[PDB]
Coordinates of all heavy atoms in Angstrom, one line a residue:
Chain C
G1236 N -13.6 16.3 25.1 CA -12.4 15.7 24.5 C -12.3 16.1 23.0 O -11.2 16.0 22.4
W1237 N -13.4 16.4 22.3 CA -13.4 16.8 20.9 C -14.7 17.5 20.7 O -15.6 17.5 21.5 CB -13.2 15.6 20.0 CG -14.3 14.6 20.1 CD1 -14.6 13.8 21.2 CD2 -15.2 14.3 19.1 NE1 -15.7 13.0 20.9 CE2 -16.1 13.3 19.6 CE3 -15.4 14.7 17.8 CZ2 -17.2 12.8 18.9 CZ3 -16.5 14.2 17.1 CH2 -17.3 13.3 17.6
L1238 N -14.9 18.0 19.5 CA -16.0 18.8 19.2 C -16.9 18.2 18.1 O -16.7 18.3 16.9 CB -15.6 20.2 18.7 CG -14.8 21.0 19.7 CD1 -14.3 22.3 19.0 CD2 -15.7 21.3 20.9
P1239 N -18.0 17.4 18.5 CA -19.0 17.0 17.5 C -19.7 18.2 17.0 O -19.8 19.3 17.6 CB -19.9 16.0 18.3 CG -19.7 16.4 19.8 CD -18.3 17.0 19.9
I1240 N -20.4 17.9 15.8 CA -21.2 19.0 15.2 C -22.2 19.5 16.2 O -22.6 20.7 16.2 CB -21.8 18.5 13.9 CG1 -22.2 19.7 13.1 CG2 -22.9 17.6 14.1 CD1 -21.1 20.4 12.4
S1241 N -22.7 18.6 17.1 CA -23.7 19.1 18.1 C -23.0 20.0 19.1 O -23.7 20.9 19.7 CB -24.3 17.9 18.8 OG -23.3 17.2 19.5
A1242 N -21.8 19.8 19.4 CA -21.1 20.7 20.4 C -20.9 22.1 19.7 O -21.1 23.1 20.4 CB -19.7 20.1 20.7
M1243 N -20.6 22.1 18.5 CA -20.6 23.4 17.8 C -21.9 24.1 17.7 O -22.1 25.3 17.9 CB -20.0 23.3 16.4 CG -18.7 22.5 16.3 SD -18.2 22.1 14.6 CE -16.7 21.3 14.8
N1244 N -23.0 23.3 17.5 CA -24.3 23.8 17.5 C -24.8 24.3 18.8 O -25.6 25.2 18.9 CB -25.3 22.8 17.0 CG -25.1 22.4 15.5 OD1 -24.6 23.2 14.7 ND2 -25.5 21.2 15.1
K1245 N -24.2 23.7 19.9 CA -24.6 24.2 21.2 C -24.0 25.5 21.6 O -24.7 26.4 22.2 CB -24.2 23.1 22.3 CG -24.5 23.5 23.7 CD -25.9 23.7 24.0 CE -26.8 22.4 23.9 NZ -28.1 22.6 24.5
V1246 N -22.7 25.7 21.3 CA -22.1 26.9 21.6 C -22.7 28.1 20.7 O -22.8 29.2 21.2 CB -20.6 26.8 21.3 CG1 -19.9 28.2 21.4 CG2 -19.9 25.8 22.2
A1247 N -23.1 27.8 19.5 CA -23.8 28.8 18.7 C -25.0 29.2 19.3 O -25.3 30.4 19.4 CB -24.0 28.2 17.3
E1248 N -25.8 28.3 19.9 CA -27.1 28.7 20.5 C -26.9 29.5 21.7 O -27.6 30.5 21.9 CB -27.9 27.4 20.8 CG -29.2 27.6 21.4 CD -29.9 26.3 21.9 OE1 -29.2 25.3 22.0 OE2 -31.1 26.3 22.1
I1249 N -25.9 29.1 22.6 CA -25.8 29.8 23.9 C -25.3 31.2 23.7 O -25.7 32.1 24.5 CB -24.8 29.0 24.8 CG1 -25.5 27.7 25.3 CG2 -24.4 29.8 25.9 CD1 -26.8 27.9 26.0
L1250 N -24.5 31.5 22.7 CA -24.0 32.8 22.4 C -24.8 33.6 21.4 O -24.5 34.7 21.1 CB -22.5 32.7 22.0 CG -21.6 32.0 23.0 CD1 -20.2 31.8 22.3 CD2 -21.5 32.8 24.3
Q1251 N -25.9 33.0 20.9 CA -26.7 33.6 19.9 C -25.9 34.1 18.7 O -25.9 35.2 18.4 CB -27.6 34.7 20.5 CG -28.6 34.2 21.5 CD -28.1 34.2 22.9 OE1 -27.6 35.1 23.4 NE2 -28.3 33.0 23.5
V1252 N -25.2 33.1 18.1 CA -24.3 33.3 17.0 C -24.8 32.4 15.9 O -25.3 31.3 16.2 CB -22.9 33.1 17.3 CG1 -22.0 33.2 16.1 CG2 -22.4 34.2 18.3
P1253 N -24.7 32.7 14.6 CA -25.0 31.7 13.6 C -24.1 30.5 13.7 O -22.9 30.7 13.9 CB -24.8 32.5 12.3 CG -24.8 33.9 12.6 CD -24.4 34.0 14.1
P1254 N -24.6 29.3 13.5 CA -23.8 28.1 13.6 C -22.6 28.2 12.6 O -21.5 27.7 12.9 CB -24.7 27.0 13.3 CG -26.0 27.5 13.7 CD -26.1 28.9 13.4
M1255 N -22.8 28.7 11.4 CA -21.7 28.8 10.4 C -20.5 29.5 11.0 O -19.4 29.1 10.8 CB -22.2 29.4 9.2 CG -21.1 29.5 8.1 SD -20.8 28.0 7.3 CE -19.0 27.8 7.5
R1256 N -20.8 30.6 11.7 CA -19.7 31.4 12.3 C -18.9 30.6 13.4 O -17.7 30.8 13.6 CB -20.2 32.7 12.8 CG -20.9 33.5 11.8 CD -20.0 34.0 10.7 NE -20.8 34.6 9.6 CZ -20.9 34.1 8.4 NH1 -20.4 33.0 8.0 NH2 -21.6 34.8 7.5
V1257 N -19.6 29.7 14.0 CA -18.9 28.7 14.9 C -18.1 27.7 14.2 O -17.0 27.3 14.5 CB -19.9 28.1 15.9 CG1 -19.2 27.3 17.0 CG2 -20.7 29.2 16.6
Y1258 N -18.7 27.2 13.1 CA -18.0 26.2 12.2 C -16.7 26.8 11.7 O -15.7 26.1 11.5 CB -18.9 25.8 11.1 CG -20.2 25.2 11.5 CD1 -21.3 25.1 10.6 CD2 -20.4 24.6 12.8 CE1 -22.5 24.5 11.0 CE2 -21.6 24.1 13.1 CZ -22.6 24.0 12.2 OH -23.8 23.5 12.6
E1259 N -16.7 28.1 11.3 CA -15.5 28.8 10.8 C -14.4 28.8 11.8 O -13.3 28.5 11.5 CB -15.9 30.2 10.4 CG -16.9 30.3 9.3 CD -16.8 31.6 8.5 OE1 -17.0 32.7 9.1 OE2 -16.6 31.5 7.3
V1260 N -14.7 29.0 13.1 CA -13.7 29.0 14.1 C -13.2 27.7 14.4 O -11.9 27.5 14.6 CB -14.2 29.7 15.4 CG1 -13.4 29.3 16.6 CG2 -14.3 31.2 15.3
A1261 N -14.0 26.7 14.4 CA -13.6 25.3 14.7 C -12.6 24.8 13.7 O -11.6 24.2 14.0 CB -14.8 24.4 14.8
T1262 N -12.9 25.1 12.4 CA -12.1 24.6 11.3 C -10.8 25.5 11.2 O -9.8 25.0 10.7 CB -12.8 24.6 10.0 OG1 -13.3 26.0 9.7 CG2 -14.0 23.7 10.0
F1263 N -10.8 26.7 11.6 CA -9.7 27.6 11.4 C -8.6 27.3 12.3 O -7.4 27.2 11.9 CB -10.1 29.1 11.5 CG -9.0 30.0 11.2 CD1 -8.8 30.5 9.9 CD2 -8.2 30.5 12.2 CE1 -7.8 31.4 9.7 CE2 -7.1 31.4 11.9 CZ -7.0 31.8 10.7
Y1264 N -8.9 27.1 13.6 CA -7.8 26.9 14.6 C -7.5 25.5 14.8 O -8.4 24.6 14.9 CB -8.4 27.6 15.9 CG -8.5 29.0 15.8 CD1 -9.7 29.6 15.6 CD2 -7.4 29.9 16.0 CE1 -9.9 31.0 15.5 CE2 -7.6 31.2 15.9 CZ -8.8 31.8 15.6 OH -8.9 33.1 15.5
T1265 N -6.2 25.2 14.8 CA -5.7 23.8 14.8 C -5.9 23.0 16.1 O -5.9 21.8 16.1 CB -4.3 23.7 14.3 OG1 -3.5 24.6 15.1 CG2 -4.2 24.1 12.8
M1266 N -6.0 23.8 17.2 CA -6.1 23.1 18.5 C -7.5 22.5 18.7 O -7.7 21.7 19.7 CB -5.8 24.0 19.6 CG -4.3 24.2 19.8 SD -4.0 25.5 21.0 CE -4.8 24.9 22.5
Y1267 N -8.5 22.7 17.9 CA -9.8 22.2 18.0 C -9.8 20.8 17.3 O -9.4 20.7 16.1 CB -10.8 23.1 17.4 CG -11.1 24.3 18.2 CD1 -11.1 25.6 17.6 CD2 -11.3 24.3 19.5 CE1 -11.3 26.7 18.3 CE2 -11.5 25.4 20.3 CZ -11.5 26.6 19.6 OH -11.7 27.8 20.4
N1268 N -10.3 19.8 18.0 CA -10.3 18.4 17.4 C -11.7 18.1 17.0 O -12.7 18.0 17.8 CB -9.9 17.4 18.5 CG -8.5 17.7 19.0 OD1 -7.5 17.8 18.2 ND2 -8.3 17.8 20.3
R1269 N -11.9 18.0 15.7 CA -13.2 17.7 15.1 C -13.3 16.2 14.9 O -14.4 15.7 14.4 CB -13.3 18.4 13.7 CG -13.3 19.9 13.9 CD -13.4 20.6 12.6 NE -12.1 20.6 11.8 CZ -11.9 20.0 10.7 NH1 -12.9 19.3 10.1 NH2 -10.7 20.0 10.2
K1270 N -12.4 15.4 15.2 CA -12.5 13.9 15.4 C -11.9 13.5 16.7 O -11.0 14.2 17.3 CB -11.7 13.2 14.3 CG -12.3 13.3 12.9 CD -11.5 12.5 11.9 CE -11.4 13.1 10.5 NZ -10.4 12.6 9.7
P1271 N -12.4 12.4 17.3 CA -11.9 12.0 18.6 C -10.4 11.7 18.5 O -9.9 11.2 17.5 CB -12.7 10.7 18.9 CG -13.9 10.8 18.1 CD -13.6 11.6 16.9
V1272 N -9.7 12.0 19.6 CA -8.3 11.7 19.7 C -8.0 10.9 21.0 O -8.9 10.8 21.9 CB -7.4 12.9 19.7 CG1 -7.3 13.5 18.3 CG2 -7.9 14.0 20.7
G1273 N -6.9 10.2 21.1 CA -6.6 9.4 22.2 C -6.5 10.2 23.5 O -6.4 11.4 23.5
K1274 N -6.5 9.5 24.6 CA -6.4 10.1 25.9 C -5.2 11.1 26.0 O -5.3 12.1 26.6 CB -6.4 9.1 27.1 CG -6.1 9.7 28.4 CD -6.0 8.7 29.5 CE -7.3 7.9 29.8 NZ -8.4 8.8 30.1
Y1275 N -4.1 10.7 25.4 CA -2.9 11.5 25.3 C -2.7 11.9 23.8 O -2.4 11.0 23.0 CB -1.7 10.8 25.9 CG -2.0 10.3 27.3 CD1 -2.2 8.9 27.5 CD2 -2.2 11.2 28.3 CE1 -2.4 8.5 28.8 CE2 -2.4 10.7 29.6 CZ -2.5 9.3 29.8 OH -2.8 8.9 31.1
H1276 N -2.8 13.2 23.6 CA -2.5 13.7 22.2 C -1.1 14.2 22.2 O -0.8 15.3 22.7 CB -3.5 14.9 22.0 CG -3.6 15.2 20.5 ND1 -4.2 16.4 20.1 CD2 -3.2 14.6 19.4 CE1 -4.1 16.5 18.8 NE2 -3.5 15.4 18.3
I1277 N -0.2 13.4 21.6 CA 1.2 13.7 21.5 C 1.5 14.6 20.3 O 1.0 14.3 19.2 CB 2.1 12.5 21.5 CG1 1.9 11.6 22.7 CG2 3.5 12.8 21.3 CD1 2.2 10.2 22.6
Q1278 N 2.2 15.7 20.5 CA 2.4 16.7 19.5 C 3.9 17.0 19.4 O 4.4 17.7 20.3 CB 1.6 18.0 19.9 CG 0.1 17.7 19.8 CD -0.7 18.9 20.3 OE1 -0.1 20.0 20.6 NE2 -2.0 18.9 20.2
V1279 N 4.5 16.5 18.4 CA 5.9 16.6 18.2 C 6.2 17.9 17.3 O 5.6 18.0 16.2 CB 6.6 15.4 17.6 CG1 8.1 15.5 17.6 CG2 6.1 14.2 18.4
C1280 N 7.1 18.7 17.7 CA 7.4 19.9 16.9 C 8.5 19.5 15.9 O 9.5 18.9 16.3 CB 7.9 21.0 17.8 SG 8.4 22.5 16.9
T1281 N 8.3 19.9 14.7 CA 9.2 19.5 13.6 C 9.8 20.7 12.9 O 10.4 20.6 11.8 CB 8.6 18.5 12.6 OG1 7.4 19.1 12.1 CG2 8.2 17.2 13.3
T1282 N 9.5 21.9 13.3 CA 10.0 23.1 12.7 C 11.5 23.2 12.8 O 12.1 22.5 13.6 CB 9.3 24.4 13.2 OG1 7.9 24.1 13.3 CG2 9.5 25.5 12.3
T1283 N 12.1 24.1 12.0 CA 13.5 24.1 11.8 C 14.3 24.1 13.1 O 15.2 23.2 13.3 CB 13.9 25.2 10.9 OG1 13.4 25.0 9.6 CG2 15.5 25.3 10.8
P1284 N 14.1 25.0 14.1 CA 14.9 24.9 15.3 C 14.9 23.6 16.0 O 15.9 23.1 16.5 CB 14.3 26.0 16.2 CG 13.7 27.0 15.2 CD 13.2 26.2 14.1
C1285 N 13.7 22.9 16.1 CA 13.6 21.6 16.6 C 14.2 20.6 15.7 O 14.8 19.6 16.1 CB 12.2 21.3 17.0 SG 11.6 22.0 18.5
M1286 N 14.0 20.7 14.4 CA 14.5 19.8 13.4 C 16.0 19.8 13.5 O 16.6 18.7 13.2 CB 14.0 20.2 12.0 CG 14.5 19.2 10.9 SD 16.0 19.8 10.1 CE 15.4 21.3 9.3
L1287 N 16.6 20.9 13.8 CA 18.1 20.9 13.8 C 18.6 20.1 15.0 O 19.8 19.6 15.0 CB 18.6 22.4 13.9 CG 18.4 23.2 12.6 CD1 18.8 24.6 12.9 CD2 19.2 22.7 11.5
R1288 N 17.9 20.0 16.1 CA 18.3 19.2 17.2 C 17.7 17.8 17.2 O 17.6 17.1 18.2 CB 17.8 19.9 18.6 CG 18.0 21.4 18.6 CD 19.4 21.7 19.1 NE 19.8 21.1 20.4 CZ 20.9 21.4 21.0 NH1 21.8 22.2 20.5 NH2 21.2 20.8 22.1
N1289 N 17.4 17.3 16.0 CA 17.1 15.9 15.7 C 15.7 15.5 16.3 O 15.6 14.6 17.1 CB 18.2 15.0 16.2 CG 18.4 13.8 15.4 OD1 17.6 13.5 14.5 ND2 19.4 13.0 15.7
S1290 N 14.7 16.3 16.0 CA 13.3 15.9 16.3 C 12.9 14.7 15.5 O 11.9 14.1 15.8 CB 12.4 17.1 16.1 OG 12.2 17.4 14.8
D1291 N 13.6 14.4 14.4 CA 13.3 13.2 13.6 C 13.5 12.0 14.5 O 12.7 11.0 14.4 CB 14.2 13.1 12.4 CG 13.8 14.1 11.3 OD1 13.1 15.1 11.6 OD2 14.1 13.8 10.1

Side-chain angles (χ1 to χ4, degrees):
Chain C
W1237 65 292
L1238 298 173
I1240 197 78
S1241 66
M1243 311 171 177
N1244 291 336
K1245 174 63 67 168
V1246 174
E1248 182 185 17
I1249 288 305
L1250 302 172
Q1251 293 88 54
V1252 171
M1255 180 75 237
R1256 305 295 172 248
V1257 187
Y1258 302 159
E1259 298 202 301
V1260 160
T1262 57
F1263 185 88
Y1264 293 98
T1265 50
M1266 281 173 60
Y1267 290 132
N1268 298 309
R1269 297 177 286 114
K1270 288 183 217 163
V1272 285
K1274 174 184 291 306
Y1275 306 110
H1276 194 196
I1277 298 158
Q1278 294 179 357
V1279 187
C1280 181
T1281 56
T1282 312
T1283 292
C1285 280
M1286 183 265 297
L1287 291 171
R1288 315 278 302 186
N1289 215 353
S1290 71
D1291 285 23

